[PDB]
């Protein structure tokens, strides 16, 4: 179990395609992930109140069960994150439904991952929401992450908007 | 998700070692499993009432999460069983505890698996309970399983007692 710290940017300009072109030369491409996420809720412990999440993700066929704890920051998206790979999404989903969990929502996206000296940049195109960028830092303080993101958006002339909301939260709002 | 049908015998005589010797010649050895099981309960939906179980098993280092549904028979142990392999027992345990599940008990055993023409015989030595045998049938009716077990105990002169109780139930009783 461990802290996941990231900054999320809603992209205003340019397109993510153009941003890929701008970073293509100094950032190393890692992989492209087609991610379909199912989120769950507990009938007797509303997660919306507790700021918790239970997610079953299918990323390029790999199945991941993830618990996310409440946010620990107002400057960045910082939450405790516990993940395990499971063998079958259908059966893990059935087990969750059998235990009383109810499917609350679905989030689908294409994520392109880039690495730059201990930073992971994820160009996210979120089905029905739009184009976003997420940055994470490997062994980095909240101040190091904030500083790198400032340098990142400036170096590549990105118009943007910061948010600590989850894709699930923002998709609700968008609807 | 699918029905698991088995018959469980408490062994009175001879020892399991002797039973291994008696079946060694016509039954094919499969593997030996050191199984440590953690069982869980839901605080607001007592599993003891619903006849359900949630188990996290470590069998020779393989980690399996299993949901068991209520019993469907009085003649054999018949329950719906849904299992998935997970990558980390510690994290799966943490996720369950984070979701509100509480560890209710532990069952530890050595199981030796033997196969005989679509039947799986499991010689079980259960820590603090004693020596048991479980039989399962592959695509077999309750009547085929019952008949084979009768033939099995007779052919190998096994004194025994049948039970549809779970090891968890019997260990409670034994304490
Ligand atoms: Ca994220
Ligand atoms: Ca059994």
> Contact A40/A96 with Cβ under 8 angstroms?
yes
Cross-chain Cβ contact A86/B82 below 8 Å:
no
CA proximity to A115, closest of A35, A34, A33, A23: A23
Write the residue in A69, A91, A99 that is nearest to B1 by C-beta: A91
Query: Which residues neighbour B171 within 8 Å (Cβ) at sequence distance 6 or greater?
Result: B105, B107, B126, B128, B129
Q: How far is CA A33 from CA A37, A115, A125, B48, in A?
A: 12, 14, 11, 42
- Residue B96 phi, psi dihedral angles, 5° rounding: -60, -45
Contacts of the segment A15-23: beta carbons below 8 A, 24+ positions apart: A15/A131, A16/A112, A16/A123, A16/A125, A16/A131, A16/A133, A19/A123, A19/A133, A19/A156, A19/A158, A20/A112, A20/A123, A22/A156, A22/A157, A23/A114, A23/A116, A23/A121, A23/A156
Contact between B135 and B122 (Cβ < 8 Å): yes
**Residue A25, number of CB atoms within 10 A of its CB:** 6
Beta bridge partners of B44: none
Cα B112 to Cα B9, B145, B174: the distances in Å are: 15, 19, 23
Cβ–Cβ gap A83/B100 under 8 Å = no
* CA-wise closest residue to A80 among A45, A124, A50: A50
The residue to which tokens 């039973």 are assigned: B19
Closest alpha carbon to B6 in B102, B93, B113? B113
Q: How many structural domains compose chain A?
A: 1
Whole-number Å distance between alpha carbons of B172 and A129:
53
Could you tell me which residues come within 8 angstroms of residue A1 by beta carbon, excluding any fewer than 6 positions away? Answer: A80, A81, A82, B91, B94
**Tokens standing for A71?**
């946010």
Residue with tokens 């730059």: A116
Which residues, including other chains, have CB under 8 Å from residue B100's CB and lie 6 or more apart?
A: A42, A45, B42, B43
**Positive or negative torsion for Cα B31, B32, B38, B44:** positive
For ligand 1, the distance from its centroid to the CA atom of residue A6, given in whole angstroms, is 7
Q: How far is CA A87 from CA A84, B50, B87, in A?
A: 10, 27, 9
Cα→Cα distances B171→A53, B90, B104, B106, B122, Å: 36, 24, 12, 10, 18
From the number of C-beta atoms within 10 Å of its C-beta (0-12, 13-18, 19+), residue A63 rates as buried
Of A164, A167, A170, the residue nearest A71 (C-alpha):
A164
Method: X-ray
Contact A78, A3 (CB under 8 A): yes
Distances in Å between the Cα of A57 and the Cα atoms of A83, B28, B43, B51, B96 are: 10, 40, 27, 30, 17
* CA distance readout (Å), B18 to A12, B131, B151, B161: 76, 12, 18, 17
Cβ proximity of A142 and A157 under 8 Å: no
Instruction: List, in sequence order, every residue forming a beta bridge with A114; answer none if it has no partner.
Output: A29, A121
Q: Are A8 and A163 in contact (CB under 8 A)?
A: yes
- Residues contacting residue A175 through CB under 8 Å, at least 6 positions apart: none
- Residue A98: count of CB within 10 angstroms of its CB: 17
* Resolution value (Å, 1 decimal): 2.0
Distance (Å) from CA B140 to ligand 1 centroid: 48
Name the closest residue on chain A to residue B42, using Cα atoms. Answer: A99
**DSSP 3-state assignment of A138?**
coil
Q: What is the dihedral of CA B38, B44, B45, B46, to 10 degrees?
A: 60
d(CA B111, CA A81): 36
Joined tokens for residue A69 = 């704890």
Q: Tell me which residue range forms the domain holding B142.
A: 1-175
- State the maximum Cα–Cα separation within chain B, in Å, rounded to a whole number: 51
What ranges make up the beta strands (E) of chain A? 2-13, 28-41, 53-59, 62-71, 77-86, 102-115, 119-126, 130-137, 159-163
Round the CA-based radius of gyration of chain B to a whole number and report it.
16
Query: Burial level of B33, CB count in 10 A (0-12/13-18/19+)?
Result: middle
- Does A83 reach chain B within 8 Å, measured CB to CB? yes
Cβ neighbours around A143 below 10 Å, total: 10
Q: Which residue of B has its CA nearest to A90?
A: B1
Tell whether the torsion through CA atoms of B51, B57, B59 and B62 is positive or negative.
Answer: positive
In this structure, chain A runs to a length of 175
Q: Are B63 and B52 in contact (CB under 8 A)?
A: no
Q: What would you report as the CA-atom Rg of chain A, rounded to the nearest whole angstrom? A: 16
Torsion of the alpha carbons at B165, B169, B173 and B175, rounded to the nearest 10: 140
Q: Which of B69, B99, B101, B102 to mutate to test the interface with A (most CBs of A within 10 A)?
A: B99
> Using CA atoms, how far apart are residues A68 and A4, in angstroms rounded to an integer?
9
Q: What is the DSSP letter of A175?
A: -
Phi first, then psi, for residue A146 (nearest 5°) are -55, -45
**Is B87 in CB contact (< 8 Å) with chain A?**
yes
């Amino acid at each position: 179990s461990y802290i996941e710290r990231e900054i999320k940017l809603r992209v205003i300009s340019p397109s993510l395609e153009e941003i890929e072109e701008r970073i293509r030369n100094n950032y190393t491409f890692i992989n492209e992930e087609h991610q379909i996420d199912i989120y769950y809720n507990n009938p007797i412990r509303d997660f919306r109140k507790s700021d918790e999440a239970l997610r079953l993700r299918n990323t390029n066929g790999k199945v991941i069960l993830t618990y996310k704890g409440p946010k620990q920051s107002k400057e960045t998206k910082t939450r405790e994150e516990i993940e395990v790979e499971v063998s079958d999404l259908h059966k893990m989903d059935l087990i969750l439904r059998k235990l009383g969990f109810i499917r609350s929502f679905q989030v689908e996206k294409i994520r392109k991952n880039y690495k730059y000296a201990d930073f992971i940049i994820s160009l996210d195109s979120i089905k029905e929401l739009g184009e976003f960028i997420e940055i994470e830092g490997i062994n980095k303080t909240e101040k190091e992450l904030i500083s790198f993101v400032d340098e990142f958006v400036k170096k590549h002339q990105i118009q943007y908007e910061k948010t600590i909301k989850s894709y699930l939260e923002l998709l609700v709002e968008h609807a």
